[PDB]
Structures are given as C-alpha cells and as structure tokens.
Amino acid sequence: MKPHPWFFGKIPRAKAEEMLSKQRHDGAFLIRESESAPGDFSLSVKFGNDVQHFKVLRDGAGKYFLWVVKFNSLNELVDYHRSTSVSRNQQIFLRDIE
Amino acid sequence: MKPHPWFFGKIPRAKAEEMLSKQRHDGAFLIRESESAPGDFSLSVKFGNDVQHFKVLRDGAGKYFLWVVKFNSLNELVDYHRSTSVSRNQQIFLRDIE
Amino acid sequence: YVNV
Amino acid sequence: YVNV
Numbered sequence A, B: 001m002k003p004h005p006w007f008f009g010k011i012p013r014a015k016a017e018e019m020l021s022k023q024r025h026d027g028a029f030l031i032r033e034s035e036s037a038p039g040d041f042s043l044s045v046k047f048g049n050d051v052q053h054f055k056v057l058r059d060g061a062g063k064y065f066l067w068v069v070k071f072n073s074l075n076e077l078v079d080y081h082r083s084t085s086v087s088r089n090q091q092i093f094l095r096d097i098e
Numbered sequence C, D: 001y002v003n004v
Helices: A013-021 A074-080 B013-021 B074-080
Strands: A029-033 A041-047 A050-058 B029-033 B041-047 B050-058
Touching (some): B013 B041
Antiparallel strands (some): A029 A041, A041 A050, B029 B041
C-alpha cells in the first residue's frame, strides 16, 4: 500500500555508488534501471568501503534471478535476499537505505 | 536521488484499483508487477469513476512500450506520459498519487 | 489490458 | 557485474 523506497528508477551507476558509499550499514541497497543495458535492472549494494553491483537476469519464462533461484518479481527477489545472501562470494544481506 | 513513489512492486491488481479509485485526480497512477504475468509490469491509472490498466510490453531490444514509441526505462516511459496521453483512446496524463 |  |  506504499511505494518501495528501494526502487530508484533510472539513476546512473556512479550516482548510486555515491549515495550508497555514504550509507553506514553493509547491505544498504537500491534497484536501478541500467543505462549500459536499457531494459535491464541492476542491484547496487553497499559492502564495506565498496559498492557491489549485480545484474538482474530474466529467464525464458520471464522470471528474475541473480544466480540460480528464480523469482516472479523484483519485489520477491529483493525480499528473499533480506534473509539469504545476495552474493555467492560473501555473506551480504539486503537492508533498506537509511 | 530519491525513490520513485509510483513504483509499488508486487501489489494485486484489485489492491491497486482500490487505492486509485480513492484518488481525486484523473491520471493518478502507479506501476506494479503483474501476478497474472510474472516478470511483466502493469500501469494502473485513475480515470473518472474507473481505473484503466495497461500492460508494459518489451521489444526484442528490451525497450519498454505501450503502443508504438519505445523507452529505455520504465522511468522514461512514465515521465513521457506525464505530457503525452498514456491512451490512444482518451486523453489521459499521468500524475503522481496524492 | 487497454493496449492489448 | 559480480554475478556476471
């Protein structure tokens, strides 16, 4: 019943990095619409002194995914990764920007 | 630098209608993630005593569109229709929910 | 959908 | 991208 604060639309990658690098908690994130790949979504996440970027992929059925698990919406992909690491390399959990 | 208030993620069509029907201005809208078509976006707009729904389509290049003009992002599709009718039937201009 |  |  309220808009998701993590959806920032078409903001440049550099802009997302500037904003997230200022965040204090690992996991602070946002979903943006990629410029380099029009029509694609990108997930930017604060982690330590860096900002990691993940590309949201879509399968033949139209489901969104990052690695192997599939989702019926960006909304479900995001909520799923609030409890399950968004990265297969390090343990990183999505947290709302503050 | 601020999240778009029109992106509501995965809210049911019926829910979007309930919320928009309460709006006072023609054009009040929101973008939601379709349940009937997972991976697809839907544009719901208040118009008179009704709520019209449009499916956001994507072409082979990945661009989003409703009729013929193509967009590189939902963000641009939305802003474009703030000044250009979102419908080829009636004149309806997108306005933020209030 | 209106456009469909 | 990390996952790419």
